[PDB]
Amino acid sequence: GLRRLFANQLVGRRNI
Numbered sequence: 001g002l003r004r005l006f007a008n009q010l011v012g013r014r015n016i
Contacts, residue, residue, distance in 0.1 A: 001013065001014050002014060002015055002016065003015060003016040004016040
């Protein structure tokens with residue numbers, strides 16, 4: 001993975 005709800009270490013940012 002998420003953006004704000006939970007940022008992923010490797011990669012994410014799919015939804016806030």
